[PDB]
Amino acid sequence: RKKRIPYSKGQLRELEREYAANKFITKDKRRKISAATSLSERQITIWFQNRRVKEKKVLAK
Amino acid sequence: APKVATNIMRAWLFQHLTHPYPSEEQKKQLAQDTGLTILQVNNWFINARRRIVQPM
DNA sequence: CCTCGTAAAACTGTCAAC
DNA sequence: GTTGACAGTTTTACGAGG
C-alpha cells in the first residue's frame, strides 16, 4: 500500500472549491484539476469519496 | 535530552523543508543511530512540524 | 464511482514534568 | 518557556460487495 503523504494546504484549497460547487466530479474536471495540482487522476477520485463521508459525519446532533 | 539526537534530526528537517516527512525506511535509519525508538522519531517529527515549520 | 468498512500514516489538544 | 508524550480525532489509500 502507498504510504501516507498528506496534501499541501493549497491543493486542499483547489478541492473544496469544486466539492462545494458539486459533490461529484466529471471525468473532464477529474483531469483538468489533476494537472494543476499534479495529483493522480486516481487520487483525486478518492478524495471526494472520503470528503463525501465527512459531510455525513457532520450530520448532527 | 539527549542532545546530539536533536542536532541530527534538526539537520534532516532543515535539509528538506520542501518535503518535511521521512520514509519509514529513513526513520528506521534514524532510530538505528539515535538511541531513540521509532515511535520517538515519529512523535518528534510530528511535534517538530507544528513546533517549527508553521511560521516558515 | 459508490457507500461502507478497514489498514496506517500524520494531526489536534492538552499536560504534568524534569 | 518548550520539550517529549499521549488518547482521541482527523486525513490518505485500498479492497470487499452490490
Short mmCIF file of all heavy atoms in Angstrom, two decimals, chain C residues 2-6 8 10-17, chain D residues 1-2 4-8 10 13-18:
data_model
loop_
_atom_site.label_atom_id
_atom_site.label_comp_id
_atom_site.label_asym_id
_atom_site.label_seq_id
_atom_site.Cartn_x
_atom_site.Cartn_y
_atom_site.Cartn_z
P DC C 2 -19.82 8.68 -6.50
OP1 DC C 2 -19.97 9.61 -7.64
OP2 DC C 2 -19.17 9.15 -5.26
"O5'" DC C 2 -21.27 8.10 -6.16
"C5'" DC C 2 -21.61 6.73 -6.49
"C4'" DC C 2 -21.46 5.81 -5.28
"O4'" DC C 2 -20.87 4.56 -5.70
"C3'" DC C 2 -20.57 6.34 -4.14
"O3'" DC C 2 -21.32 6.51 -2.95
"C2'" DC C 2 -19.48 5.28 -4.00
"C1'" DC C 2 -20.11 4.06 -4.64
N1 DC C 2 -19.14 3.03 -5.16
C2 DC C 2 -19.59 1.73 -5.38
O2 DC C 2 -20.77 1.45 -5.15
N3 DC C 2 -18.71 0.81 -5.84
C4 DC C 2 -17.44 1.15 -6.08
N4 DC C 2 -16.62 0.21 -6.53
C5 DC C 2 -16.97 2.47 -5.86
C6 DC C 2 -17.84 3.37 -5.40
P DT C 3 -21.50 7.98 -2.32
OP1 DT C 3 -22.30 8.78 -3.27
OP2 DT C 3 -20.16 8.45 -1.91
"O5'" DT C 3 -22.38 7.74 -1.01
"C5'" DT C 3 -21.80 7.16 0.15
"C4'" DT C 3 -22.25 5.72 0.32
"O4'" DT C 3 -21.45 4.84 -0.54
"C3'" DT C 3 -22.09 5.18 1.74
"O3'" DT C 3 -23.32 4.64 2.22
"C2'" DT C 3 -21.01 4.11 1.61
"C1'" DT C 3 -21.15 3.67 0.18
N1 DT C 3 -19.92 3.02 -0.39
C2 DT C 3 -19.80 1.65 -0.33
O2 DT C 3 -20.65 0.92 0.14
N3 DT C 3 -18.63 1.15 -0.86
C4 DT C 3 -17.60 1.87 -1.43
O4 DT C 3 -16.59 1.34 -1.88
C5 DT C 3 -17.78 3.31 -1.45
C7 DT C 3 -16.72 4.20 -2.03
C6 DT C 3 -18.92 3.81 -0.92
P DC C 4 -23.57 4.51 3.81
OP1 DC C 4 -24.93 3.97 4.00
OP2 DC C 4 -23.21 5.81 4.42
"O5'" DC C 4 -22.49 3.43 4.28
"C5'" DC C 4 -22.66 2.05 3.95
"C4'" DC C 4 -21.42 1.23 4.30
"O4'" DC C 4 -20.44 1.36 3.25
"C3'" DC C 4 -20.69 1.65 5.58
"O3'" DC C 4 -21.04 0.79 6.66
"C2'" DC C 4 -19.20 1.56 5.22
"C1'" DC C 4 -19.18 1.04 3.79
N1 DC C 4 -18.12 1.65 2.93
C2 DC C 4 -17.09 0.85 2.41
O2 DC C 4 -17.08 -0.36 2.66
N3 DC C 4 -16.13 1.43 1.64
C4 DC C 4 -16.18 2.74 1.40
N4 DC C 4 -15.21 3.27 0.64
C5 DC C 4 -17.21 3.57 1.93
C6 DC C 4 -18.15 2.99 2.68
P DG C 5 -20.46 1.07 8.13
OP1 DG C 5 -21.37 0.43 9.12
OP2 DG C 5 -20.22 2.53 8.21
"O5'" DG C 5 -19.05 0.31 8.15
"C5'" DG C 5 -18.99 -1.09 7.87
"C4'" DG C 5 -17.58 -1.52 7.47
"O4'" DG C 5 -17.13 -0.70 6.36
"C3'" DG C 5 -16.52 -1.36 8.56
"O3'" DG C 5 -16.22 -2.62 9.15
"C2'" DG C 5 -15.30 -0.75 7.84
"C1'" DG C 5 -15.72 -0.65 6.38
N9 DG C 5 -15.29 0.59 5.74
C8 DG C 5 -15.91 1.82 5.81
N7 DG C 5 -15.29 2.75 5.13
C5 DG C 5 -14.20 2.09 4.57
C6 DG C 5 -13.17 2.59 3.74
O6 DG C 5 -13.01 3.74 3.30
N1 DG C 5 -12.26 1.59 3.40
C2 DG C 5 -12.33 0.28 3.82
N2 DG C 5 -11.36 -0.54 3.40
N3 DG C 5 -13.29 -0.19 4.61
C4 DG C 5 -14.19 0.77 4.94
P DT C 6 -15.28 -2.70 10.46
OP1 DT C 6 -15.44 -4.05 11.04
OP2 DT C 6 -15.54 -1.50 11.29
"O5'" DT C 6 -13.80 -2.58 9.87
"C5'" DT C 6 -13.34 -3.52 8.92
"C4'" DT C 6 -11.98 -3.12 8.36
"O4'" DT C 6 -12.13 -2.00 7.46
"C3'" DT C 6 -10.97 -2.64 9.39
"O3'" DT C 6 -10.29 -3.74 9.99
"C2'" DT C 6 -10.04 -1.74 8.56
"C1'" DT C 6 -10.86 -1.39 7.31
N1 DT C 6 -11.05 0.08 7.10
C2 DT C 6 -10.28 0.73 6.17
O2 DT C 6 -9.45 0.18 5.47
N3 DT C 6 -10.54 2.08 6.06
C4 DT C 6 -11.45 2.82 6.78
O4 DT C 6 -11.60 4.02 6.61
C5 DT C 6 -12.22 2.07 7.75
C7 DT C 6 -13.25 2.76 8.60
C6 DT C 6 -11.99 0.75 7.86
P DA C 8 -2.00 -1.98 10.00
OP1 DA C 8 -1.80 -2.88 8.84
OP2 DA C 8 -1.24 -2.24 11.24
"O5'" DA C 8 -1.69 -0.47 9.56
"C5'" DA C 8 -0.89 -0.22 8.42
"C4'" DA C 8 -0.81 1.26 8.10
"O4'" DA C 8 -2.12 1.87 8.23
"C3'" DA C 8 0.13 2.06 9.01
"O3'" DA C 8 1.03 2.83 8.24
"C2'" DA C 8 -0.82 2.94 9.82
"C1'" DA C 8 -1.98 3.12 8.86
N9 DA C 8 -3.24 3.49 9.49
C8 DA C 8 -3.85 2.88 10.54
N7 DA C 8 -4.99 3.43 10.90
C5 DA C 8 -5.13 4.49 10.01
C6 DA C 8 -6.13 5.47 9.85
N6 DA C 8 -7.22 5.54 10.62
N1 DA C 8 -5.97 6.37 8.86
C2 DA C 8 -4.88 6.30 8.09
N3 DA C 8 -3.87 5.42 8.14
C4 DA C 8 -4.06 4.54 9.13
P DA C 10 4.50 10.05 8.20
OP1 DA C 10 5.22 10.75 7.11
OP2 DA C 10 5.25 9.54 9.37
"O5'" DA C 10 3.33 10.99 8.74
"C5'" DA C 10 2.52 11.71 7.82
"C4'" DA C 10 1.35 12.36 8.53
"O4'" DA C 10 0.64 11.37 9.32
"C3'" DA C 10 1.73 13.48 9.51
"O3'" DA C 10 1.18 14.72 9.08
"C2'" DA C 10 1.14 13.02 10.85
"C1'" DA C 10 0.08 12.04 10.41
N9 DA C 10 -0.31 11.09 11.44
C8 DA C 10 0.41 10.03 11.92
N7 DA C 10 -0.20 9.36 12.86
C5 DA C 10 -1.40 10.03 13.02
C6 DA C 10 -2.51 9.83 13.87
N6 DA C 10 -2.57 8.83 14.76
N1 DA C 10 -3.54 10.69 13.77
C2 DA C 10 -3.47 11.68 12.89
N3 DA C 10 -2.49 11.97 12.04
C4 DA C 10 -1.48 11.10 12.16
P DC C 11 1.51 16.07 9.89
OP1 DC C 11 1.55 17.19 8.92
OP2 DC C 11 2.67 15.79 10.76
"O5'" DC C 11 0.23 16.26 10.83
"C5'" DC C 11 -0.66 17.34 10.60
"C4'" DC C 11 -1.95 17.13 11.34
"O4'" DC C 11 -1.92 15.84 11.98
"C3'" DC C 11 -2.23 18.13 12.46
"O3'" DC C 11 -3.15 19.13 12.03
"C2'" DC C 11 -2.80 17.28 13.61
"C1'" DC C 11 -2.83 15.86 13.05
N1 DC C 11 -2.45 14.81 14.05
C2 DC C 11 -3.29 14.55 15.13
O2 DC C 11 -4.34 15.20 15.25
N3 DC C 11 -2.94 13.60 16.03
C4 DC C 11 -1.80 12.92 15.87
N4 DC C 11 -1.49 11.99 16.78
C5 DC C 11 -0.92 13.17 14.77
C6 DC C 11 -1.28 14.11 13.89
P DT C 12 -3.27 20.52 12.82
OP1 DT C 12 -4.66 21.01 12.69
OP2 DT C 12 -2.14 21.37 12.40
"O5'" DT C 12 -3.03 20.10 14.35
"C5'" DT C 12 -3.67 20.82 15.38
"C4'" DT C 12 -4.98 20.15 15.77
"O4'" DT C 12 -4.76 18.72 15.95
"C3'" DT C 12 -5.58 20.65 17.08
"O3'" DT C 12 -6.99 20.72 17.01
"C2'" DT C 12 -5.10 19.62 18.09
"C1'" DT C 12 -5.10 18.34 17.27
N1 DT C 12 -4.13 17.32 17.77
C2 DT C 12 -4.50 16.49 18.81
O2 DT C 12 -5.59 16.56 19.36
N3 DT C 12 -3.55 15.58 19.19
C4 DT C 12 -2.29 15.42 18.64
O4 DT C 12 -1.51 14.57 19.06
C5 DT C 12 -1.96 16.31 17.55
C7 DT C 12 -0.62 16.23 16.88
C6 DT C 12 -2.89 17.21 17.17
P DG C 13 -7.79 21.75 17.94
OP1 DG C 13 -9.24 21.53 17.73
OP2 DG C 13 -7.22 23.10 17.71
"O5'" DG C 13 -7.41 21.30 19.43
"C5'" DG C 13 -8.06 20.17 20.01
"C4'" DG C 13 -7.44 19.79 21.35
"O4'" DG C 13 -6.28 18.95 21.13
"C3'" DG C 13 -6.95 20.97 22.21
"O3'" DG C 13 -7.74 21.09 23.38
"C2'" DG C 13 -5.48 20.65 22.52
"C1'" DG C 13 -5.35 19.18 22.16
N9 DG C 13 -4.03 18.79 21.69
C8 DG C 13 -3.23 19.45 20.78
N7 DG C 13 -2.10 18.85 20.54
C5 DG C 13 -2.15 17.71 21.34
C6 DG C 13 -1.20 16.67 21.51
O6 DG C 13 -0.10 16.55 20.96
N1 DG C 13 -1.64 15.71 22.41
C2 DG C 13 -2.85 15.75 23.07
N2 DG C 13 -3.11 14.74 23.91
N3 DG C 13 -3.75 16.72 22.92
C4 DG C 13 -3.33 17.66 22.05
P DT C 14 -7.57 22.35 24.36
OP1 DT C 14 -8.91 22.72 24.87
OP2 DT C 14 -6.74 23.36 23.67
"O5'" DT C 14 -6.71 21.77 25.57
"C5'" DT C 14 -7.13 20.58 26.22
"C4'" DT C 14 -5.96 19.87 26.86
"O4'" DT C 14 -5.03 19.44 25.84
"C3'" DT C 14 -5.13 20.72 27.81
"O3'" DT C 14 -5.66 20.59 29.17
"C2'" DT C 14 -3.68 20.20 27.61
"C1'" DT C 14 -3.81 19.17 26.48
N1 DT C 14 -2.69 19.23 25.49
C2 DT C 14 -1.86 18.14 25.34
O2 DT C 14 -1.98 17.11 25.98
N3 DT C 14 -0.86 18.31 24.41
C4 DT C 14 -0.62 19.42 23.63
O4 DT C 14 0.30 19.47 22.82
C5 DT C 14 -1.53 20.53 23.83
C7 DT C 14 -1.37 21.79 23.04
C6 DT C 14 -2.51 20.38 24.74
P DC C 15 -4.73 20.26 30.44
OP1 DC C 15 -5.62 20.34 31.63
OP2 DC C 15 -3.52 21.12 30.40
"O5'" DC C 15 -4.30 18.73 30.21
"C5'" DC C 15 -3.99 17.90 31.30
"C4'" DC C 15 -2.49 17.72 31.44
"O4'" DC C 15 -1.84 17.85 30.16
"C3'" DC C 15 -1.79 18.75 32.33
"O3'" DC C 15 -1.66 18.27 33.66
"C2'" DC C 15 -0.42 18.95 31.65
"C1'" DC C 15 -0.47 18.05 30.42
N1 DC C 15 0.19 18.63 29.20
C2 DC C 15 1.15 17.88 28.51
O2 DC C 15 1.43 16.74 28.90
N3 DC C 15 1.75 18.42 27.41
C4 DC C 15 1.42 19.65 27.01
N4 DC C 15 2.04 20.13 25.93
C5 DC C 15 0.45 20.43 27.71
C6 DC C 15 -0.13 19.89 28.78
P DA C 16 -1.63 19.29 34.90
OP1 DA C 16 -3.03 19.59 35.27
OP2 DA C 16 -0.70 20.39 34.54
"O5'" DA C 16 -0.94 18.44 36.07
"C5'" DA C 16 -1.01 17.01 36.07
"C4'" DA C 16 0.30 16.40 35.61
"O4'" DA C 16 0.72 17.04 34.38
"C3'" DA C 16 1.47 16.58 36.60
"O3'" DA C 16 1.94 15.29 37.11
"C2'" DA C 16 2.53 17.35 35.82
"C1'" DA C 16 2.13 17.15 34.36
N9 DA C 16 2.52 18.25 33.47
C8 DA C 16 2.24 19.58 33.61
N7 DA C 16 2.72 20.33 32.65
C5 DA C 16 3.37 19.43 31.82
C6 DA C 16 4.09 19.59 30.62
N6 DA C 16 4.29 20.77 30.02
N1 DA C 16 4.61 18.48 30.05
C2 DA C 16 4.42 17.30 30.64
N3 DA C 16 3.76 17.03 31.77
C4 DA C 16 3.26 18.15 32.31
P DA C 17 2.73 14.22 36.20
OP1 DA C 17 2.14 14.17 34.84
OP2 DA C 17 2.78 12.96 36.98
"O5'" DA C 17 4.23 14.78 36.12
"C5'" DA C 17 4.90 14.86 34.86
"C4'" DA C 17 6.24 15.57 35.00
"O4'" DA C 17 6.47 16.42 33.87
"C3'" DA C 17 6.35 16.50 36.20
"O3'" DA C 17 6.63 15.79 37.44
"C2'" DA C 17 7.47 17.45 35.77
"C1'" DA C 17 7.38 17.45 34.24
N9 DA C 17 6.91 18.71 33.68
C8 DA C 17 5.92 19.51 34.18
N7 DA C 17 5.71 20.60 33.48
C5 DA C 17 6.62 20.51 32.44
C6 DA C 17 6.90 21.35 31.35
N6 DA C 17 6.25 22.49 31.13
N1 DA C 17 7.88 20.97 30.50
C2 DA C 17 8.52 19.82 30.73
N3 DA C 17 8.35 18.94 31.72
C4 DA C 17 7.37 19.35 32.55
P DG D 1 10.62 33.68 26.50
OP1 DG D 1 10.67 35.09 26.05
OP2 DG D 1 10.89 33.35 27.92
"O5'" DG D 1 9.21 33.05 26.09
"C5'" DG D 1 8.56 32.13 26.97
"C4'" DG D 1 9.34 30.82 27.03
"O4'" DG D 1 9.07 30.16 28.28
"C3'" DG D 1 8.98 29.81 25.94
"O3'" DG D 1 10.04 29.72 24.99
"C2'" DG D 1 8.75 28.49 26.70
"C1'" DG D 1 9.25 28.79 28.10
N9 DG D 1 8.55 28.09 29.17
C8 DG D 1 7.42 28.50 29.82
N7 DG D 1 7.02 27.67 30.75
C5 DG D 1 7.96 26.65 30.71
C6 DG D 1 8.05 25.48 31.49
O6 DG D 1 7.30 25.09 32.40
N1 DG D 1 9.16 24.71 31.14
C2 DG D 1 10.06 25.03 30.15
N2 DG D 1 11.06 24.17 29.95
N3 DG D 1 9.99 26.13 29.41
C4 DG D 1 8.91 26.89 29.75
P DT D 2 9.75 29.20 23.50
OP1 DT D 2 10.77 29.82 22.62
OP2 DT D 2 8.32 29.40 23.20
"O5'" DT D 2 10.02 27.63 23.59
"C5'" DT D 2 11.23 27.14 24.14
"C4'" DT D 2 11.17 25.64 24.35
"O4'" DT D 2 10.50 25.34 25.62
"C3'" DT D 2 10.36 24.87 23.29
"O3'" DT D 2 10.90 23.58 23.06
"C2'" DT D 2 9.01 24.77 23.95
"C1'" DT D 2 9.45 24.44 25.36
N1 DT D 2 8.41 24.54 26.43
C2 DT D 2 8.43 23.64 27.46
O2 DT D 2 9.26 22.76 27.56
N3 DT D 2 7.44 23.79 28.39
C4 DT D 2 6.44 24.75 28.39
O4 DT D 2 5.59 24.80 29.28
C5 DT D 2 6.46 25.67 27.28
C7 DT D 2 5.42 26.75 27.18
C6 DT D 2 7.44 25.53 26.36
P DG D 4 12.74 16.97 22.73
OP1 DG D 4 14.05 16.29 22.71
OP2 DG D 4 12.14 17.47 21.47
"O5'" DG D 4 11.68 15.98 23.40
"C5'" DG D 4 12.11 15.03 24.36
"C4'" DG D 4 10.93 14.34 25.02
"O4'" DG D 4 9.90 15.34 25.29
"C3'" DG D 4 10.26 13.25 24.16
"O3'" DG D 4 10.18 12.02 24.89
"C2'" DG D 4 8.88 13.82 23.83
"C1'" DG D 4 8.64 14.82 24.95
N9 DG D 4 7.75 15.92 24.57
C8 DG D 4 7.88 16.74 23.48
N7 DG D 4 6.93 17.63 23.39
C5 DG D 4 6.12 17.38 24.49
C6 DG D 4 4.94 18.03 24.92
O6 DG D 4 4.36 18.99 24.39
N1 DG D 4 4.44 17.46 26.09
C2 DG D 4 5.00 16.40 26.75
N2 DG D 4 4.38 15.99 27.87
N3 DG D 4 6.11 15.78 26.36
C4 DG D 4 6.62 16.33 25.23
P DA D 5 9.54 10.71 24.21
OP1 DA D 5 10.14 9.52 24.84
OP2 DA D 5 9.60 10.90 22.74
"O5'" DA D 5 7.99 10.79 24.60
"C5'" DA D 5 7.62 10.98 25.96
"C4'" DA D 5 6.11 10.99 26.11
"O4'" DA D 5 5.60 12.31 25.80
"C3'" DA D 5 5.35 10.02 25.19
"O3'" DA D 5 4.62 9.09 25.97
"C2'" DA D 5 4.44 10.93 24.35
"C1'" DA D 5 4.33 12.17 25.21
N9 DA D 5 4.02 13.39 24.48
C8 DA D 5 4.67 13.90 23.39
N7 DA D 5 4.17 15.03 22.94
C5 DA D 5 3.12 15.29 23.81
C6 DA D 5 2.19 16.34 23.88
N6 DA D 5 2.17 17.37 23.03
N1 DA D 5 1.27 16.30 24.87
C2 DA D 5 1.29 15.26 25.73
N3 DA D 5 2.11 14.22 25.76
C4 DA D 5 3.02 14.29 24.76
P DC D 6 4.17 7.68 25.35
OP1 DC D 6 4.50 6.64 26.35
OP2 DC D 6 4.72 7.58 23.97
"O5'" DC D 6 2.59 7.79 25.23
"C5'" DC D 6 1.82 8.09 26.39
"C4'" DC D 6 0.58 8.88 26.03
"O4'" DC D 6 0.96 10.11 25.40
"C3'" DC D 6 -0.36 8.20 25.03
"O3'" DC D 6 -1.41 7.53 25.70
"C2'" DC D 6 -0.88 9.36 24.16
"C1'" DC D 6 -0.15 10.59 24.69
N1 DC D 6 0.31 11.53 23.62
C2 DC D 6 -0.32 12.77 23.48
O2 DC D 6 -1.24 13.07 24.24
N3 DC D 6 0.11 13.61 22.50
C4 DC D 6 1.11 13.25 21.70
N4 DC D 6 1.49 14.12 20.76
C5 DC D 6 1.76 11.99 21.83
C6 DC D 6 1.33 11.17 22.80
P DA D 7 -2.21 6.34 24.97
OP1 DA D 7 -2.14 5.17 25.87
OP2 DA D 7 -1.73 6.23 23.58
"O5'" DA D 7 -3.72 6.87 24.91
"C5'" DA D 7 -4.44 7.12 26.12
"C4'" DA D 7 -5.57 8.11 25.88
"O4'" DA D 7 -5.07 9.25 25.15
"C3'" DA D 7 -6.73 7.57 25.06
"O3'" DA D 7 -7.97 8.12 25.51
"C2'" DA D 7 -6.38 8.00 23.64
"C1'" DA D 7 -5.64 9.31 23.85
N9 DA D 7 -4.57 9.55 22.89
C8 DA D 7 -3.66 8.64 22.42
N7 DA D 7 -2.80 9.15 21.56
C5 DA D 7 -3.17 10.48 21.47
C6 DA D 7 -2.65 11.56 20.72
N6 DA D 7 -1.60 11.45 19.90
N1 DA D 7 -3.25 12.76 20.86
C2 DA D 7 -4.30 12.86 21.69
N3 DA D 7 -4.87 11.93 22.44
C4 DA D 7 -4.26 10.75 22.28
P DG D 8 -9.36 7.57 24.93
OP1 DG D 8 -10.38 7.75 25.98
OP2 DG D 8 -9.10 6.21 24.38
"O5'" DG D 8 -9.67 8.54 23.70
"C5'" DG D 8 -9.94 9.92 23.94
"C4'" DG D 8 -9.88 10.72 22.65
"O4'" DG D 8 -8.53 10.68 22.12
"C3'" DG D 8 -10.79 10.20 21.52
"O3'" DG D 8 -11.80 11.15 21.20
"C2'" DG D 8 -9.84 9.95 20.34
"C1'" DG D 8 -8.60 10.74 20.72
N9 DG D 8 -7.37 10.20 20.16
C8 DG D 8 -6.85 8.94 20.35
N7 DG D 8 -5.73 8.74 19.71
C5 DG D 8 -5.49 9.94 19.04
C6 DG D 8 -4.43 10.31 18.19
O6 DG D 8 -3.45 9.64 17.84
N1 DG D 8 -4.58 11.62 17.73
C2 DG D 8 -5.63 12.46 18.06
N2 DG D 8 -5.60 13.68 17.52
N3 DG D 8 -6.63 12.11 18.86
C4 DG D 8 -6.50 10.84 19.31
P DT D 10 -13.43 14.12 14.08
OP1 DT D 10 -14.35 15.28 14.02
OP2 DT D 10 -13.97 12.75 13.99
"O5'" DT D 10 -12.30 14.29 12.95
"C5'" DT D 10 -11.69 15.56 12.74
"C4'" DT D 10 -10.33 15.41 12.09
"O4'" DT D 10 -9.71 14.19 12.54
"C3'" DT D 10 -10.34 15.31 10.57
"O3'" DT D 10 -10.15 16.60 9.97
"C2'" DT D 10 -9.18 14.35 10.24
"C1'" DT D 10 -8.74 13.80 11.60
N1 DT D 10 -8.61 12.31 11.63
C2 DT D 10 -7.50 11.72 11.06
O2 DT D 10 -6.62 12.35 10.51
N3 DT D 10 -7.48 10.35 11.14
C4 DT D 10 -8.42 9.53 11.73
O4 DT D 10 -8.30 8.31 11.75
C5 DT D 10 -9.55 10.21 12.31
C7 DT D 10 -10.65 9.43 12.98
C6 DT D 10 -9.59 11.55 12.24
P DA D 13 -2.50 9.39 -0.95
OP1 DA D 13 -1.04 9.27 -1.12
OP2 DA D 13 -3.30 10.16 -1.94
"O5'" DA D 13 -3.13 7.92 -0.85
"C5'" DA D 13 -2.52 6.95 -0.02
"C4'" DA D 13 -3.25 5.61 -0.10
"O4'" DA D 13 -4.37 5.61 0.83
"C3'" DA D 13 -3.84 5.28 -1.48
"O3'" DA D 13 -3.36 4.01 -1.93
"C2'" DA D 13 -5.35 5.28 -1.23
"C1'" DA D 13 -5.44 4.93 0.24
N9 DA D 13 -6.69 5.32 0.88
C8 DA D 13 -7.37 6.50 0.72
N7 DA D 13 -8.47 6.58 1.42
C5 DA D 13 -8.53 5.36 2.09
C6 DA D 13 -9.46 4.82 3.00
N6 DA D 13 -10.56 5.47 3.40
N1 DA D 13 -9.22 3.59 3.48
C2 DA D 13 -8.12 2.94 3.07
N3 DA D 13 -7.18 3.34 2.23
C4 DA D 13 -7.44 4.58 1.77
P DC D 14 -3.59 3.54 -3.45
OP1 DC D 14 -2.28 3.47 -4.12
OP2 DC D 14 -4.65 4.39 -4.04
"O5'" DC D 14 -4.18 2.06 -3.30
"C5'" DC D 14 -5.36 1.85 -2.53
"C4'" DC D 14 -5.35 0.49 -1.86
"O4'" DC D 14 -6.06 0.57 -0.60
"C3'" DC D 14 -6.03 -0.62 -2.65
"O3'" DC D 14 -5.37 -1.87 -2.44
"C2'" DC D 14 -7.46 -0.61 -2.12
"C1'" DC D 14 -7.36 0.02 -0.73
N1 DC D 14 -8.38 1.11 -0.48
C2 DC D 14 -9.29 0.99 0.58
O2 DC D 14 -9.25 0.00 1.31
N3 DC D 14 -10.20 1.99 0.77
C4 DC D 14 -10.21 3.05 -0.04
N4 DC D 14 -11.12 4.00 0.20
C5 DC D 14 -9.30 3.18 -1.12
C6 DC D 14 -8.41 2.20 -1.30
P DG D 15 -5.61 -3.09 -3.46
OP1 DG D 15 -4.48 -4.03 -3.29
OP2 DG D 15 -5.90 -2.54 -4.80
"O5'" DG D 15 -6.95 -3.79 -2.92
"C5'" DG D 15 -6.92 -4.56 -1.71
"C4'" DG D 15 -8.32 -4.87 -1.22
"O4'" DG D 15 -8.99 -3.63 -0.83
"C3'" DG D 15 -9.24 -5.54 -2.25
"O3'" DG D 15 -9.73 -6.78 -1.74
"C2'" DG D 15 -10.36 -4.52 -2.47
"C1'" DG D 15 -10.34 -3.72 -1.19
N9 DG D 15 -10.90 -2.38 -1.30
C8 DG D 15 -10.60 -1.43 -2.25
N7 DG D 15 -11.26 -0.31 -2.10
C5 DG D 15 -12.05 -0.54 -0.97
C6 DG D 15 -12.98 0.32 -0.32
O6 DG D 15 -13.30 1.48 -0.63
N1 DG D 15 -13.56 -0.30 0.78
C2 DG D 15 -13.28 -1.58 1.21
N2 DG D 15 -13.94 -2.00 2.29
N3 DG D 15 -12.42 -2.38 0.61
C4 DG D 15 -11.84 -1.80 -0.47
P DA D 16 -10.71 -7.70 -2.63
OP1 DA D 16 -10.15 -9.08 -2.59
OP2 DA D 16 -10.91 -7.04 -3.94
"O5'" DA D 16 -12.10 -7.68 -1.84
"C5'" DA D 16 -12.22 -8.37 -0.59
"C4'" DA D 16 -13.54 -8.04 0.10
"O4'" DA D 16 -13.72 -6.60 0.13
"C3'" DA D 16 -14.79 -8.61 -0.59
"O3'" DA D 16 -15.71 -9.13 0.38
"C2'" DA D 16 -15.36 -7.41 -1.33
"C1'" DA D 16 -14.96 -6.25 -0.45
N9 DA D 16 -14.81 -4.99 -1.17
C8 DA D 16 -13.89 -4.71 -2.15
N7 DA D 16 -13.99 -3.49 -2.63
C5 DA D 16 -15.04 -2.94 -1.92
C6 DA D 16 -15.64 -1.66 -1.96
N6 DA D 16 -15.25 -0.69 -2.78
N1 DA D 16 -16.67 -1.44 -1.12
C2 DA D 16 -17.06 -2.42 -0.30
N3 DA D 16 -16.57 -3.65 -0.17
C4 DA D 16 -15.55 -3.85 -1.02
P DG D 17 -16.92 -10.10 -0.08
OP1 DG D 17 -17.39 -10.82 1.12
OP2 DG D 17 -16.47 -10.86 -1.27
"O5'" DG D 17 -18.07 -9.08 -0.55
"C5'" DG D 17 -18.74 -8.28 0.41
"C4'" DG D 17 -19.74 -7.34 -0.25
"O4'" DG D 17 -19.02 -6.27 -0.94
"C3'" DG D 17 -20.64 -7.99 -1.32
"O3'" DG D 17 -22.00 -7.55 -1.16
"C2'" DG D 17 -20.03 -7.49 -2.62
"C1'" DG D 17 -19.59 -6.11 -2.22
N9 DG D 17 -18.64 -5.48 -3.13
C8 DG D 17 -17.55 -6.07 -3.74
N7 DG D 17 -16.89 -5.25 -4.51
C5 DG D 17 -17.59 -4.05 -4.41
C6 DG D 17 -17.35 -2.80 -5.02
O6 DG D 17 -16.44 -2.49 -5.80
N1 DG D 17 -18.30 -1.85 -4.65
C2 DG D 17 -19.35 -2.09 -3.79
N2 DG D 17 -20.17 -1.05 -3.54
N3 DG D 17 -19.58 -3.25 -3.21
C4 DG D 17 -18.67 -4.18 -3.56
P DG D 18 -23.19 -8.18 -2.03
OP1 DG D 18 -23.33 -9.59 -1.59
OP2 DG D 18 -22.99 -7.88 -3.46
"O5'" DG D 18 -24.49 -7.37 -1.57
"C5'" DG D 18 -24.42 -5.95 -1.31
"C4'" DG D 18 -24.73 -5.11 -2.55
"O4'" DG D 18 -23.50 -4.77 -3.22
"C3'" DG D 18 -25.61 -5.79 -3.62
"O3'" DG D 18 -26.88 -5.15 -3.70
"C2'" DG D 18 -24.81 -5.63 -4.93
"C1'" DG D 18 -23.77 -4.58 -4.58
N9 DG D 18 -22.51 -4.71 -5.34
C8 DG D 18 -21.77 -5.84 -5.53
N7 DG D 18 -20.69 -5.65 -6.24
C5 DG D 18 -20.72 -4.29 -6.54
C6 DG D 18 -19.81 -3.50 -7.28
O6 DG D 18 -18.77 -3.86 -7.84
N1 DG D 18 -20.22 -2.17 -7.34
C2 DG D 18 -21.36 -1.67 -6.76
N2 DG D 18 -21.58 -0.35 -6.92
N3 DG D 18 -22.22 -2.40 -6.06
C4 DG D 18 -21.84 -3.70 -5.99
#
